[PDB]
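Help wanted!
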Amino acid sequence: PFEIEVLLPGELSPAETSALQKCEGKIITFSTLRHRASLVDIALSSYYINGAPPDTLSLLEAYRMRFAAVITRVIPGKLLAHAIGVGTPTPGLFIQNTSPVDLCNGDYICLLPPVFGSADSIRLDSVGLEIVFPLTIPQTLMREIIAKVVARAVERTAAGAQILPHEVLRGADVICYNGRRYELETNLQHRDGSDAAIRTLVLNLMFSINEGCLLLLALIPTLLVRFPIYETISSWISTSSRLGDTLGTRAILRVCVFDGPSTVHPGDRTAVIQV
Amino acid sequence: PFEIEVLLPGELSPAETSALQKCEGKIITFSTLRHRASLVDIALSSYYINGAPPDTLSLLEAYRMRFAAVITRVIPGKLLAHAIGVGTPTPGLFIQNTSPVDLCNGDYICLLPPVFGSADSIRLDSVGLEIVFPLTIPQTLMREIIAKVVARAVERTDVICYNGRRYELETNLQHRDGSDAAIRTLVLNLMFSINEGCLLLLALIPTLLVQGAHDGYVNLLIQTANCVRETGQLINIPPMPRIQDGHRRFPIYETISSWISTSSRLGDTLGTRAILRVCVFDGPSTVHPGDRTAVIQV
Amino acid sequence: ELAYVRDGVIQFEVQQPMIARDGPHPVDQPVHNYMVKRIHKRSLSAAF
Amino acid sequence: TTQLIQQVSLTDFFRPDIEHAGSIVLILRHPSDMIGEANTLTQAGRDPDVLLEGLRNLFNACTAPWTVGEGGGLRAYVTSLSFIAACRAEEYTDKQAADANRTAIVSAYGCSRMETRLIRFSECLRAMVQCHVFPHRFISFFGSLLEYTIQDNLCNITAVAKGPQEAARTDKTSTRRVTANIPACVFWDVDKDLHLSADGLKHVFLVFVYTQRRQREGVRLHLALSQLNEQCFGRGIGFLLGRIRAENAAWGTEGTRALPLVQLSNDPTSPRCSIGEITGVNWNLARQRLYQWTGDFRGLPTQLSCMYAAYTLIGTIPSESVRYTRRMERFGGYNVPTIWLEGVVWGGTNTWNECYY
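Answered by r_m:
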């Protein structure tokens, strides 16, 4: 069995080491798998690009390249974790639910950067770094989560772009799973992440679809009863493919409960099998 | 741990035998998976479509259909090899780099026929067959080679820059029965990416151009795209229709949703999917051409 | 040495028995407890 | 080497007493999510609450009908493959095998409130495929049944998750080993339709054929066993289902001048609209005409209204030259033709590939 040991820092305040004890079964991403690592790898500092803090589009990409690990148990002077990588036979692997939606048996686990609300995370002011944990959602729920968030941001620009808004709606968007409705983003105010992290993602998406239903229109004009015209095609195929693999969906874990309760609520921990 | 044992033909010359021992961590493809096989299926003769050597486009389809296998330690009589596609635990799996470009940690591996210069390959004169080996290039370089090959196919019926270095691709399309098929699978994707919501996304082109200025980042996205940069100052885009029952539905939902599915499908149907992930422990961060890296099954 | 005790402490540890029973229900497990207690100080005084 | 999954549920769709050891068992999502998805994905013009009408009557003819809405963990979680095979038996090609399994599952069960339950489930699926709420995202997969314990109308079952089939010990039957058993109605191998050699390793898939017309919809369930590749199965299925694909492309949606962009961009002397007027001061007289195009596309076949199948990998068979055996044996008080699969390793994530062409 392959395991990682994270060196706990010295001169850590008792309030910080206590809250670190709470996050037992959470997921940690590593850049290079090694037996001994430091806190700078897990912290957000090693995660940002181009100096500025990371973005949703970059958050999704790094989750594929980086390897993931699961914390097992914390020690007043030591921190251990297990890899979910090549072949290691992790015994008794349990994870903690970080998403607001429930999980049932036979649901495959996946990962997602925090989009709904402000991400919770432990913050160590003494050393000066913080550790952000990824979100854990089932398979059949992510594809509509991404679509609803992106579609919401486009609605905001349209209301500002158009001279008059086309307001009239159906109410408010809601996500229902196991008979529980989430009802994300009630108000119109509090544009916390409207254009803070999902800003660049809506741009590449607002473009790739635009040249999509514009190229076919300008290539075959019989649908509705100086110019390269070839490098635009190769540029479209490259982007639309490069936007596809990063906006992918790969199951990472599968919950398998034996003698425990079927459903789990946000905050509970359950045993999972390595897919 | 599933392994396929390829039996070497008899009376093999010592020169070719030593040449086969060099191909230690290369990839071979099988038509039908079995514990025992011959050398004919691995040979290029088995790639023949009608009666002739295959085509590049025909090779892409041949790679999807055939099974995948990696060569391991070869002995004088037998040639052992392990499988990849089917779910099977393989401990300590290593491949040999064949592409001219270098790899690093956390790189997905794809497959493509030799597009570059004349492919190195073991040639057996006594047996009479030749074994060519597929090239392993990363995911990023894979998506650009295909995009240029398809664009050249439409032209009939190429410099690529990587790490500040340029290359040349000699695409081959001496056949035609497979060239038109790539066009069919292409147009079928743009046609299924058109819903009644493009109109709204098409009505935002002006404000995109307004946002193009005084931003310094959208311009780069504007220069690379030709259609939107032309239609934005040449079409009027009549203002807006209404919704049939807008009291309970969301018209812009499926457009952003249905596109997501057809985008991930495009990268695989046009070419080859991702097959492996490179992750070396106690090794160099980068690997040069010809060296061997330990990879993880995807 | 009582004027320097400054909140001494005692502790208790008990266990609980259980009975095995069939039926398609979650199966039980034996339980143990741990409890702690402190002291309370007071003076007595007299005059002469 | 193998792992197990336990779950308790109501026995109105599954009876671990009569079902043979080694049969396939599936589970269902909460029905409350169906309406939340239907009222937002229903095609324009169609009534969105016909599914609600079809759904309410299902539980009205089911025990404990006052327990819907909270999802406390005591609902009809799991179901059997033969149940859906009998519910849709009027659509399979093997006429006699379909109806035999139907009467068998009717007789072996309560046989009193069973026929009504079946017809409710039938139009339930029919209304499911009426508003694009396709029942391939609400039906998951469990492994073959291994052990069960029931006292009355509530059962605790455990099944294999992934791995070899005969690596477990049922430990109460005659032997300690079991093999996969399926009704002969759902079995459909495609290689013997596609005329290719059947040697080596073969994968297992479940398909969900959809028919979309006016007041006439159909949904089968086939367990395909083919040697074809992971993704090439999609191209293979379309060749056999080319009829329904074209039927749907014409009867799926039942509820304008081009523009010469490249022409007027290749030629000069066209009305130009330089950035100097889009800066945003008087952006109406600058764009007064610039073109008209009178263009709009509302009613067109989407990639979701032309879907006709959805498959998913379940397991493989490493032993070359499989020798699946078909025979008739007693199922309760009746005989049904079952096919017996040996040595099948379960696995694979639950990802559905939709064949919309």
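OP: Thanks! One thing I noticed: Chain D touches chain B through 55 residues (CB under 8 Å).
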